[PDB]
Amino acid sequence: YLTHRCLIAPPEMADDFFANTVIYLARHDEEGAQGIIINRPAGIQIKELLNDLDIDADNVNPHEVLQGGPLRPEAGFVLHTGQPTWHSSIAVGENVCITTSKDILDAIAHNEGVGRYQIALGYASWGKNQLEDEIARGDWLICDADMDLIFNLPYDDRWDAAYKKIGVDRTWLAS
C-alpha cells in the first residue's frame, strides 16, 4: 500500500481545504487510509497547546503546532523518530512513528527525549477504496517521505520540495 508515502496536492487542485498540501500517509489498508498534513501550521505555539491540555511547560522550546486535517480537530498526533517506545505509538515507516499518548507531551514539555517532531491537530481520512479512486483519476501526486519533508524543511517550502522531488527518479518539469 501507500503507507509512509506523501500525497501532494497537484497545482491545479481546486479543493479549498486540501490545495497546496503535503500529506504524510500514516495508514493505508483494505479499510481505507489516514494521513496527516505536514505543511500547514495552525498558528498555535506548543506552550499554548500544552497549557490547554493541563500540562505545565514554562520552559518548553518554541515550536509550531500543525493542522493535520479537517477531521477531529481535537485529536493530537506526534510525529517523531526512533522506535514506538511510548504508551500509544506506532511505527509508520523508516524510523518514523506517530504517538497519541500523553507521555510524549510531558517529554516535549521538558525538552527531552523526543528529538525532531511535529504535533498535529486533526487528520485526513479516506474510506474503503476512496484514496485509490482519487489517485486513479489524477487527484493526487505522490512522492516518498524523507526527513527533510517531515522534519527539517521550513513548512512553507515543503510543497515546492515535494513537487520537485518527483523529478529525482523520473522526467518531471516542475513548471
Side-chain angles (χ1 to χ4, degrees):
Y1 288 69
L2 298 176
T3 306
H4 195 222
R5 302 294 297 291
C6 287
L7 294 178
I8 304 165
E12 76 279 1
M13 181 178 267
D15 188 350
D16 60 299
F17 191 84
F18 290 96
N20 196 56
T21 62
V22 177
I23 310 176
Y24 179 60
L25 294 177
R27 183 177 180 177
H28 178 32
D29 50 50
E30 52 187 58
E31 287 189 60
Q34 295 78 197
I36 299 295
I37 295 170
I38 55 173
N39 71 322
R40 182 178 294 174
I44 301 173
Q45 268 297 309
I46 181 63
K47 190 175 184 298
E48 306 179 69
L49 178 56
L50 292 175
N51 287 171
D52 292 324
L53 294 170
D54 299 65
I55 300 172
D56 298 309
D58 279 353
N59 307 302
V60 67
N61 292 331
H63 199 287
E64 306 311 308
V65 173
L66 308 181
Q67 175 178 287
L71 307 175
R72 293 273 63 82
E74 312 95 331
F77 304 92
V78 179
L79 285 166
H80 60 88
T81 64
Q83 303 175 310
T85 63
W86 312 92
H87 292 165
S88 298
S89 185
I90 304 298
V92 180
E94 307 176 304
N95 58 62
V96 178
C97 299
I98 297 188
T99 296
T100 55
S101 44
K102 304 177 71 178
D103 53 354
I104 197 167
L105 300 183
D106 288 318
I108 290 168
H110 289 272
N111 303 307
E112 63 173 72
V114 180
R116 292 167 292 175
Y117 76 93
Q118 297 306 336
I119 180 164
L121 291 173
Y123 65 103
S125 184
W126 287 266
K128 187 176 181 300
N129 297 169
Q130 194 190 309
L131 176 60
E132 294 92 326
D133 295 320
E134 280 169 37
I135 297 172
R137 58 169 178 287
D139 283 31
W140 305 96
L141 302 181
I142 309 172
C143 76
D144 288 349
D146 62 48
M147 297 298 93
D148 289 315
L149 293 176
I150 304 171
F151 304 110
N152 312 323
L153 292 169
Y155 303 113
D156 55 22
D157 284 338
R158 296 174 177 200
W159 187 90
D160 289 317
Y163 185 58
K164 205 136 297 176
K165 184 174 178 181
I166 297 170
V168 300
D169 49 57
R170 74 175 302 165
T171 304
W172 184 262
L173 209 190
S175 73

Tab-separated table of all heavy atoms in Angstrom, residues 12-73:
chain	number	residue	atom	x	y	z
A	12	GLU	N	-3.051	22.301	-9.779
A	12	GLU	CA	-4.367	22.657	-10.297
A	12	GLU	C	-5.539	22.272	-9.394
A	12	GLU	O	-6.688	22.569	-9.723
A	12	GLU	CB	-4.583	22.041	-11.687
A	12	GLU	CG	-4.883	20.546	-11.697
A	12	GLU	CD	-3.642	19.678	-11.583
A	12	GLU	OE1	-2.528	20.230	-11.468
A	12	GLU	OE2	-3.789	18.437	-11.614
A	13	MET	N	-5.268	21.620	-8.265
A	13	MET	CA	-6.347	21.219	-7.360
A	13	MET	C	-7.182	22.420	-6.917
A	13	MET	O	-6.647	23.412	-6.423
A	13	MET	CB	-5.789	20.502	-6.124
A	13	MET	CG	-6.879	20.043	-5.151
A	13	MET	SD	-6.237	19.069	-3.605
A	13	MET	CE	-6.397	17.274	-4.291
A	14	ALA	N	-8.496	22.315	-7.090
A	14	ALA	CA	-9.412	23.394	-6.728
A	14	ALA	C	-9.937	23.286	-5.299
A	14	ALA	O	-10.534	24.228	-4.780
A	14	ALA	CB	-10.581	23.430	-7.709
A	15	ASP	N	-9.715	22.137	-4.667
A	15	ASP	CA	-10.173	21.911	-3.300
A	15	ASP	C	-9.685	23.020	-2.370
A	15	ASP	O	-8.484	23.194	-2.165
A	15	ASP	CB	-9.678	20.549	-2.805
A	15	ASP	CG	-10.279	20.159	-1.468
A	15	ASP	OD1	-10.925	21.013	-0.828
A	15	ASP	OD2	-10.098	18.995	-1.056
A	16	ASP	N	-10.632	23.763	-1.806
A	16	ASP	CA	-10.321	24.873	-0.911
A	16	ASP	C	-9.528	24.473	0.331
A	16	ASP	O	-8.709	25.252	0.822
A	16	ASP	CB	-11.613	25.574	-0.483
A	16	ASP	CG	-12.561	24.649	0.253
A	16	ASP	OD1	-12.999	23.644	-0.346
A	16	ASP	OD2	-12.867	24.926	1.431
A	17	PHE	N	-9.764	23.269	0.841
A	17	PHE	CA	-9.056	22.831	2.037
A	17	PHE	C	-7.734	22.125	1.767
A	17	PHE	O	-6.728	22.418	2.412
A	17	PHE	CB	-9.925	21.900	2.883
A	17	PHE	CG	-9.347	21.619	4.243
A	17	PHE	CD1	-9.567	22.498	5.298
A	17	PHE	CD2	-8.532	20.508	4.455
A	17	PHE	CE1	-8.984	22.282	6.547
A	17	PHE	CE2	-7.942	20.283	5.699
A	17	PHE	CZ	-8.168	21.171	6.747
A	18	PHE	N	-7.730	21.192	0.822
A	18	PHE	CA	-6.516	20.442	0.537
A	18	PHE	C	-5.537	21.037	-0.467
A	18	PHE	O	-4.472	20.468	-0.699
A	18	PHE	CB	-6.870	19.011	0.132
A	18	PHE	CG	-7.396	18.180	1.270
A	18	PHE	CD1	-8.764	18.025	1.472
A	18	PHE	CD2	-6.516	17.569	2.160
A	18	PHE	CE1	-9.251	17.271	2.544
A	18	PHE	CE2	-6.991	16.814	3.237
A	18	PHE	CZ	-8.362	16.664	3.428
A	19	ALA	N	-5.875	22.176	-1.058
A	19	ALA	CA	-4.967	22.797	-2.011
A	19	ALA	C	-3.649	23.134	-1.313
A	19	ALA	O	-3.636	23.536	-0.147
A	19	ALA	CB	-5.590	24.065	-2.588
A	20	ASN	N	-2.548	22.940	-2.032
A	20	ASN	CA	-1.204	23.235	-1.542
A	20	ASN	C	-0.742	22.410	-0.344
A	20	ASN	O	0.162	22.826	0.381
A	20	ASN	CB	-1.086	24.728	-1.207
A	20	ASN	CG	0.355	25.184	-1.066
A	20	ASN	OD1	1.165	25.017	-1.980
A	20	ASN	ND2	0.680	25.771	0.079
A	21	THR	N	-1.335	21.240	-0.141
A	21	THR	CA	-0.936	20.401	0.985
A	21	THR	C	-0.013	19.245	0.616
A	21	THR	O	0.049	18.804	-0.538
A	21	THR	CB	-2.160	19.779	1.710
A	21	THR	OG1	-2.887	18.936	0.805
A	21	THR	CG2	-3.073	20.868	2.246
A	22	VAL	N	0.735	18.795	1.616
A	22	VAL	CA	1.604	17.632	1.504
A	22	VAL	C	1.087	16.795	2.671
A	22	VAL	O	1.053	17.256	3.819
A	22	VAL	CB	3.087	17.970	1.706
A	22	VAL	CG1	3.910	16.684	1.639
A	22	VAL	CG2	3.556	18.934	0.623
A	23	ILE	N	0.655	15.577	2.373
A	23	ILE	CA	0.077	14.713	3.393
A	23	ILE	C	0.856	13.429	3.620
A	23	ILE	O	1.039	12.631	2.702
A	23	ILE	CB	-1.377	14.332	3.020
A	23	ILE	CG1	-2.168	15.588	2.648
A	23	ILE	CG2	-2.038	13.599	4.183
A	23	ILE	CD1	-3.579	15.312	2.162
A	24	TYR	N	1.309	13.232	4.853
A	24	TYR	CA	2.043	12.028	5.207
A	24	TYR	C	1.020	10.933	5.496
A	24	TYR	O	0.163	11.093	6.368
A	24	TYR	CB	2.901	12.294	6.445
A	24	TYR	CG	3.696	11.102	6.922
A	24	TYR	CD1	4.633	10.486	6.097
A	24	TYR	CD2	3.525	10.601	8.210
A	24	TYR	CE1	5.384	9.399	6.544
A	24	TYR	CE2	4.274	9.515	8.668
A	24	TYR	CZ	5.201	8.920	7.831
A	24	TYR	OH	5.952	7.856	8.280
A	25	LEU	N	1.094	9.828	4.762
A	25	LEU	CA	0.149	8.736	4.970
A	25	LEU	C	0.595	7.823	6.105
A	25	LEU	O	1.560	7.070	5.977
A	25	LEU	CB	-0.037	7.936	3.679
A	25	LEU	CG	-0.701	8.723	2.545
A	25	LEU	CD1	-0.756	7.861	1.295
A	25	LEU	CD2	-2.103	9.151	2.958
A	26	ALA	N	-0.126	7.903	7.217
A	26	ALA	CA	0.181	7.120	8.404
A	26	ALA	C	-0.320	5.688	8.304
A	26	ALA	O	0.292	4.767	8.847
A	26	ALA	CB	-0.430	7.789	9.626
A	27	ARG	N	-1.435	5.504	7.609
A	27	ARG	CA	-2.017	4.179	7.462
A	27	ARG	C	-2.808	4.057	6.167
A	27	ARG	O	-3.495	4.989	5.754
A	27	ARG	CB	-2.926	3.892	8.660
A	27	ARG	CG	-3.547	2.506	8.685
A	27	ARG	CD	-4.370	2.317	9.954
A	27	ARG	NE	-4.992	0.997	10.028
A	27	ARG	CZ	-5.713	0.571	11.062
A	27	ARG	NH1	-5.900	1.359	12.112
A	27	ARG	NH2	-6.243	-0.644	11.048
A	28	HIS	N	-2.697	2.898	5.530
A	28	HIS	CA	-3.409	2.630	4.290
A	28	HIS	C	-3.554	1.126	4.134
A	28	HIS	O	-2.572	0.414	3.918
A	28	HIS	CB	-2.652	3.218	3.093
A	28	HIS	CG	-3.304	2.945	1.772
A	28	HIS	ND1	-4.671	2.846	1.622
A	28	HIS	CD2	-2.778	2.781	0.535
A	28	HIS	CE1	-4.959	2.633	0.350
A	28	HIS	NE2	-3.828	2.589	-0.331
A	29	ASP	N	-4.788	0.650	4.267
A	29	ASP	CA	-5.086	-0.771	4.143
A	29	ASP	C	-6.380	-0.984	3.368
A	29	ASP	O	-6.858	-0.083	2.680
A	29	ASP	CB	-5.191	-1.414	5.529
A	29	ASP	CG	-6.110	-0.649	6.460
A	29	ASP	OD1	-7.248	-0.336	6.053
A	29	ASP	OD2	-5.695	-0.368	7.604
A	30	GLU	N	-6.947	-2.180	3.488
A	30	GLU	CA	-8.178	-2.519	2.784
A	30	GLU	C	-9.416	-1.775	3.280
A	30	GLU	O	-10.439	-1.751	2.596
A	30	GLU	CB	-8.412	-4.033	2.853
A	30	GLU	CG	-8.342	-4.616	4.255
A	30	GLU	CD	-8.402	-6.134	4.258
A	30	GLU	OE1	-7.540	-6.766	3.611
A	30	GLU	OE2	-9.309	-6.694	4.908
A	31	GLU	N	-9.331	-1.169	4.461
A	31	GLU	CA	-10.467	-0.432	5.012
A	31	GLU	C	-10.406	1.062	4.709
A	31	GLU	O	-11.388	1.782	4.901
A	31	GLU	CB	-10.560	-0.635	6.527
A	31	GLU	CG	-11.042	-2.013	6.948
A	31	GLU	CD	-11.317	-2.102	8.437
A	31	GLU	OE1	-12.178	-1.343	8.932
A	31	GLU	OE2	-10.673	-2.932	9.113
A	32	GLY	N	-9.253	1.527	4.237
A	32	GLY	CA	-9.112	2.936	3.923
A	32	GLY	C	-7.717	3.463	4.192
A	32	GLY	O	-6.754	2.701	4.238
A	33	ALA	N	-7.611	4.775	4.372
A	33	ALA	CA	-6.325	5.407	4.632
A	33	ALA	C	-6.488	6.623	5.532
A	33	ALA	O	-7.540	7.262	5.548
A	33	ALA	CB	-5.673	5.816	3.313
A	34	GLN	N	-5.440	6.931	6.287
A	34	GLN	CA	-5.447	8.080	7.181
A	34	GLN	C	-4.118	8.799	7.027
A	34	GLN	O	-3.063	8.166	6.957
A	34	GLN	CB	-5.640	7.646	8.639
A	34	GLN	CG	-6.992	7.001	8.924
A	34	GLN	CD	-7.064	5.555	8.469
A	34	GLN	OE1	-8.149	4.989	8.335
A	34	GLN	NE2	-5.906	4.945	8.242
A	35	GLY	N	-4.173	10.124	6.968
A	35	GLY	CA	-2.956	10.892	6.808
A	35	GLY	C	-2.929	12.157	7.638
A	35	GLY	O	-3.943	12.575	8.199
A	36	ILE	N	-1.747	12.762	7.709
A	36	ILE	CA	-1.534	13.989	8.458
A	36	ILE	C	-0.881	15.020	7.542
A	36	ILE	O	0.187	14.764	6.982
A	36	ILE	CB	-0.583	13.747	9.656
A	36	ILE	CG1	-1.190	12.719	10.612
A	36	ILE	CG2	-0.292	15.061	10.367
A	36	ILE	CD1	-2.469	13.169	11.277
A	37	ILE	N	-1.525	16.171	7.369
A	37	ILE	CA	-0.949	17.235	6.552
A	37	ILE	C	0.300	17.678	7.314
A	37	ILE	O	0.244	17.906	8.527
A	37	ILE	CB	-1.922	18.423	6.420
A	37	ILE	CG1	-3.176	17.994	5.648
A	37	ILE	CG2	-1.236	19.582	5.719
A	37	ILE	CD1	-4.297	19.017	5.659
A	38	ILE	N	1.425	17.813	6.619
A	38	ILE	CA	2.662	18.190	7.298
A	38	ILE	C	3.249	19.545	6.924
A	38	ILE	O	4.394	19.841	7.273
A	38	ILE	CB	3.755	17.109	7.096
A	38	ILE	CG1	3.964	16.833	5.602
A	38	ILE	CG2	3.363	15.839	7.849
A	38	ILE	CD1	5.135	15.915	5.304
A	39	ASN	N	2.472	20.382	6.242
A	39	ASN	CA	2.992	21.689	5.855
A	39	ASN	C	2.050	22.846	6.156
A	39	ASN	O	2.159	23.906	5.545
A	39	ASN	CB	3.348	21.692	4.359
A	39	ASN	CG	2.125	21.662	3.462
A	39	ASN	OD1	1.134	20.997	3.760
A	39	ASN	ND2	2.197	22.380	2.342
A	40	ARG	N	1.137	22.660	7.105
A	40	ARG	CA	0.198	23.726	7.433
A	40	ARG	C	0.097	24.056	8.919
A	40	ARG	O	-0.739	23.498	9.627
A	40	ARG	CB	-1.196	23.383	6.901
A	40	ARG	CG	-2.227	24.473	7.148
A	40	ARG	CD	-3.571	24.100	6.555
A	40	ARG	NE	-3.512	24.030	5.099
A	40	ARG	CZ	-4.510	23.608	4.331
A	40	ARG	NH1	-5.645	23.201	4.882
A	40	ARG	NH2	-4.369	23.584	3.015
A	41	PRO	N	0.954	24.961	9.409
A	41	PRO	CA	0.907	25.336	10.826
A	41	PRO	C	-0.475	25.905	11.165
A	41	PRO	O	-1.108	26.564	10.339
A	41	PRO	CB	2.007	26.385	10.940
A	41	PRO	CG	3.009	25.920	9.939
A	41	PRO	CD	2.153	25.516	8.758
A	42	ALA	N	-0.934	25.651	12.385
A	42	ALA	CA	-2.242	26.119	12.832
A	42	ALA	C	-2.208	27.511	13.462
A	42	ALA	O	-3.257	28.078	13.775
A	42	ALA	CB	-2.831	25.120	13.819
A	43	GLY	N	-1.012	28.063	13.646
A	43	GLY	CA	-0.901	29.375	14.255
A	43	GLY	C	-1.049	29.269	15.761
A	43	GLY	O	-1.605	30.153	16.414
A	44	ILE	N	-0.552	28.167	16.306
A	44	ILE	CA	-0.607	27.901	17.737
A	44	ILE	C	0.777	27.447	18.190
A	44	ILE	O	1.401	26.611	17.537
A	44	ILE	CB	-1.615	26.774	18.053
A	44	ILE	CG1	-3.007	27.164	17.554
A	44	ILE	CG2	-1.629	26.489	19.548
A	44	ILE	CD1	-4.032	26.057	17.677
A	45	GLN	N	1.259	28.006	19.295
A	45	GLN	CA	2.564	27.620	19.828
A	45	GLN	C	2.387	26.390	20.713
A	45	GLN	O	1.331	26.193	21.316
A	45	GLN	CB	3.176	28.755	20.654
A	45	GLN	CG	4.087	29.692	19.871
A	45	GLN	CD	5.311	28.984	19.322
A	45	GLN	OE1	6.028	28.301	20.054
A	45	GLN	NE2	5.559	29.149	18.032
A	46	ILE	N	3.425	25.570	20.796
A	46	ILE	CA	3.369	24.363	21.604
A	46	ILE	C	3.027	24.650	23.070
A	46	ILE	O	2.292	23.885	23.691
A	46	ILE	CB	4.706	23.572	21.502
A	46	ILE	CG1	4.634	22.291	22.336
A	46	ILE	CG2	5.863	24.438	21.955
A	46	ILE	CD1	3.579	21.309	21.880
A	47	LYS	N	3.530	25.754	23.622
A	47	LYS	CA	3.238	26.066	25.016
A	47	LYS	C	1.743	26.270	25.227
A	47	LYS	O	1.186	25.818	26.225
A	47	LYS	CB	3.998	27.314	25.476
A	47	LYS	CG	3.916	27.538	26.990
A	47	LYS	CD	4.778	28.702	27.457
A	47	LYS	CE	4.754	28.832	28.977
A	47	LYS	NZ	3.388	29.107	29.506
A	48	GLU	N	1.092	26.950	24.288
A	48	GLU	CA	-0.343	27.194	24.395
A	48	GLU	C	-1.100	25.871	24.402
A	48	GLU	O	-1.994	25.655	25.222
A	48	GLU	CB	-0.842	28.033	23.218
A	48	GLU	CG	-0.119	29.339	22.993
A	48	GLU	CD	-0.674	30.087	21.798
A	48	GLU	OE1	-1.826	30.565	21.881
A	48	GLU	OE2	0.032	30.184	20.773
A	49	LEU	N	-0.749	24.988	23.474
A	49	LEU	CA	-1.408	23.694	23.385
A	49	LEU	C	-1.204	22.873	24.652
A	49	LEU	O	-2.159	22.332	25.205
A	49	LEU	CB	-0.891	22.915	22.170
A	49	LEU	CG	-1.467	21.507	21.991
A	49	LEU	CD1	-2.987	21.556	21.932
A	49	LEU	CD2	-0.913	20.897	20.715
A	50	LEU	N	0.040	22.774	25.115
A	50	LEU	CA	0.321	22.007	26.326
A	50	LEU	C	-0.450	22.559	27.520
A	50	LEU	O	-1.063	21.803	28.269
A	50	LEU	CB	1.826	21.995	26.616
A	50	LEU	CG	2.659	21.211	25.597
A	50	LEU	CD1	4.138	21.366	25.913
A	50	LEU	CD2	2.252	19.738	25.623
A	51	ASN	N	-0.433	23.879	27.683
A	51	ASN	CA	-1.145	24.506	28.790
A	51	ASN	C	-2.642	24.227	28.701
A	51	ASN	O	-3.303	24.022	29.720
A	51	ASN	CB	-0.903	26.019	28.796
A	51	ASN	CG	0.499	26.391	29.254
A	51	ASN	OD1	0.900	27.551	29.165
A	51	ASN	ND2	1.248	25.411	29.753
A	52	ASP	N	-3.185	24.219	27.486
A	52	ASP	CA	-4.610	23.956	27.312
A	52	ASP	C	-4.940	22.510	27.654
A	52	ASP	O	-6.076	22.187	28.005
A	52	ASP	CB	-5.056	24.267	25.879
A	52	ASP	CG	-4.995	25.748	25.557
A	52	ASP	OD1	-5.284	26.567	26.455
A	52	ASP	OD2	-4.673	26.098	24.402
A	53	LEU	N	-3.939	21.640	27.554
A	53	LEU	CA	-4.116	20.227	27.867
A	53	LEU	C	-3.761	19.961	29.327
A	53	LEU	O	-3.581	18.813	29.737
A	53	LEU	CB	-3.243	19.367	26.947
A	53	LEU	CG	-3.612	19.372	25.460
A	53	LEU	CD1	-2.520	18.679	24.655
A	53	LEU	CD2	-4.954	18.677	25.259
A	54	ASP	N	-3.659	21.035	30.102
A	54	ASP	CA	-3.337	20.956	31.523
A	54	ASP	C	-1.952	20.380	31.797
A	54	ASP	O	-1.774	19.559	32.698
A	54	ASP	CB	-4.396	20.130	32.259
A	54	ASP	CG	-5.782	20.739	32.159
A	54	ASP	OD1	-6.327	20.803	31.038
A	54	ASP	OD2	-6.325	21.157	33.203
A	55	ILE	N	-0.972	20.821	31.017
A	55	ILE	CA	0.403	20.369	31.177
A	55	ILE	C	1.303	21.585	31.321
A	55	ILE	O	1.349	22.435	30.433
A	55	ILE	CB	0.866	19.548	29.955
A	55	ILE	CG1	-0.032	18.322	29.786
A	55	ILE	CG2	2.324	19.130	30.123
A	55	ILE	CD1	0.207	17.554	28.502
A	56	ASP	N	2.006	21.679	32.446
A	56	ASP	CA	2.906	22.801	32.671
A	56	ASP	C	4.063	22.684	31.690
A	56	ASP	O	4.577	21.591	31.450
A	56	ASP	CB	3.441	22.789	34.107
A	56	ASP	CG	2.341	22.931	35.142
A	56	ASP	OD1	1.523	23.868	35.019
A	56	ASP	OD2	2.300	22.109	36.082
A	57	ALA	N	4.462	23.813	31.120
A	57	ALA	CA	5.554	23.834	30.158
A	57	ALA	C	6.171	25.223	30.091
A	57	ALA	O	6.402	25.756	29.008
A	57	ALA	CB	5.043	23.419	28.782
A	58	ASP	N	6.438	25.805	31.255
A	58	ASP	CA	7.026	27.136	31.325
A	58	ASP	C	8.350	27.259	30.582
A	58	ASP	O	8.718	28.348	30.146
A	58	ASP	CB	7.237	27.547	32.787
A	58	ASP	CG	5.969	28.059	33.440
A	58	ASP	OD1	4.953	28.225	32.732
A	58	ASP	OD2	5.992	28.305	34.665
A	59	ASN	N	9.063	26.149	30.423
A	59	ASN	CA	10.355	26.194	29.751
A	59	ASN	C	10.423	25.496	28.396
A	59	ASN	O	11.504	25.354	27.826
A	59	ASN	CB	11.428	25.617	30.676
A	59	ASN	CG	11.428	26.274	32.044
A	59	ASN	OD1	11.582	27.491	32.162
A	59	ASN	ND2	11.253	25.470	33.086
A	60	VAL	N	9.275	25.083	27.868
A	60	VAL	CA	9.262	24.391	26.584
A	60	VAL	C	9.797	25.272	25.458
A	60	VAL	O	9.524	26.474	25.404
A	60	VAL	CB	7.838	23.897	26.226
A	60	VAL	CG1	6.912	25.077	25.976
A	60	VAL	CG2	7.895	22.979	25.009
A	61	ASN	N	10.581	24.675	24.567
A	61	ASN	CA	11.136	25.418	23.443
A	61	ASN	C	10.052	25.719	22.416
A	61	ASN	O	9.177	24.888	22.154
A	61	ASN	CB	12.271	24.633	22.783
A	61	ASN	CG	13.478	24.507	23.681
A	61	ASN	OD1	13.725	25.373	24.524
A	61	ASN	ND2	14.250	23.443	23.498
A	62	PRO	N	10.085	26.924	21.827
A	62	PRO	CA	9.072	27.281	20.830
A	62	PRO	C	9.001	26.278	19.681
A	62	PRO	O	10.020	25.758	19.230
A	62	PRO	CB	9.503	28.679	20.380
A	62	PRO	CG	10.988	28.707	20.667
A	62	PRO	CD	11.066	28.008	22.001
A	63	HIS	N	7.784	26.019	19.215
A	63	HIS	CA	7.559	25.061	18.139
A	63	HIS	C	6.140	25.272	17.626
A	63	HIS	O	5.230	25.559	18.397
A	63	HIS	CB	7.704	23.642	18.698
A	63	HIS	CG	7.955	22.590	17.661
A	63	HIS	ND1	6.981	22.138	16.796
A	63	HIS	CD2	9.066	21.862	17.391
A	63	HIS	CE1	7.482	21.175	16.039
A	63	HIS	NE2	8.744	20.989	16.382
A	64	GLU	N	5.949	25.132	16.321
A	64	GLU	CA	4.620	25.304	15.758
A	64	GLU	C	3.784	24.052	15.958
A	64	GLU	O	4.317	22.956	16.111
A	64	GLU	CB	4.699	25.584	14.254
A	64	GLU	CG	5.585	26.751	13.861
A	64	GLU	CD	5.308	27.993	14.677
A	64	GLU	OE1	4.132	28.398	14.752
A	64	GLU	OE2	6.269	28.561	15.239
A	65	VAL	N	2.471	24.238	15.977
A	65	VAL	CA	1.522	23.139	16.076
A	65	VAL	C	0.874	23.130	14.695
A	65	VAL	O	0.545	24.189	14.156
A	65	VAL	CB	0.453	23.397	17.156
A	65	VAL	CG1	-0.612	22.318	17.104
A	65	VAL	CG2	1.105	23.426	18.529
A	66	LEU	N	0.702	21.946	14.118
A	66	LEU	CA	0.126	21.829	12.783
A	66	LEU	C	-1.348	21.481	12.729
A	66	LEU	O	-1.911	20.918	13.668
A	66	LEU	CB	0.874	20.759	11.986
A	66	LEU	CG	2.398	20.844	11.911
A	66	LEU	CD1	2.911	19.699	11.049
A	66	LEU	CD2	2.823	22.184	11.336
A	67	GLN	N	-1.968	21.843	11.612
A	67	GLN	CA	-3.353	21.492	11.352
A	67	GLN	C	-3.165	20.234	10.500
A	67	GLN	O	-2.719	20.306	9.347
A	67	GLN	CB	-4.048	22.595	10.554
A	67	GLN	CG	-5.469	22.256	10.126
A	67	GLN	CD	-6.120	23.406	9.388
A	67	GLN	OE1	-6.477	24.420	9.988
A	67	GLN	NE2	-6.258	23.265	8.078
A	68	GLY	N	-3.475	19.080	11.077
A	68	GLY	CA	-3.276	17.825	10.371
A	68	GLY	C	-4.329	17.375	9.383
A	68	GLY	O	-4.079	16.494	8.561
A	69	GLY	N	-5.509	17.972	9.456
A	69	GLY	CA	-6.576	17.586	8.555
A	69	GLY	C	-7.861	18.241	9.004
A	69	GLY	O	-7.881	18.930	10.022
A	70	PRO	N	-8.961	18.032	8.270
A	70	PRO	CA	-10.258	18.619	8.606
A	70	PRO	C	-11.088	17.814	9.602
A	70	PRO	O	-12.084	18.313	10.125
A	70	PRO	CB	-10.936	18.711	7.246
A	70	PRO	CG	-10.494	17.430	6.598
A	70	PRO	CD	-9.011	17.354	6.960
A	71	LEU	N	-10.677	16.579	9.870
A	71	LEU	CA	-11.424	15.718	10.779
A	71	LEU	C	-10.866	15.689	12.194
A	71	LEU	O	-9.655	15.695	12.393
A	71	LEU	CB	-11.448	14.289	10.236
A	71	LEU	CG	-11.928	14.104	8.796
A	71	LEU	CD1	-11.776	12.646	8.400
A	71	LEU	CD2	-13.377	14.558	8.666
A	72	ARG	N	-11.769	15.655	13.170
A	72	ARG	CA	-11.404	15.585	14.580
A	72	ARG	C	-10.284	16.544	14.986
A	72	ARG	O	-9.183	16.120	15.361
A	72	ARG	CB	-11.015	14.143	14.927
A	72	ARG	CG	-12.179	13.148	14.848
A	72	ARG	CD	-12.961	13.086	16.169
A	72	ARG	NE	-13.598	14.354	16.519
A	72	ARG	CZ	-14.761	14.771	16.028
A	72	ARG	NH1	-15.431	14.019	15.162
A	72	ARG	NH2	-15.251	15.946	16.393
A	73	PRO	N	-10.555	17.856	14.932
A	73	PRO	CA	-9.555	18.862	15.302
A	73	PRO	C	-9.091	18.749	16.753
A	73	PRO	O	-8.116	19.387	17.149
A	73	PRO	CB	-10.268	20.183	15.011
A	73	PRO	CG	-11.718	19.841	15.213
A	73	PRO	CD	-11.824	18.497	14.540
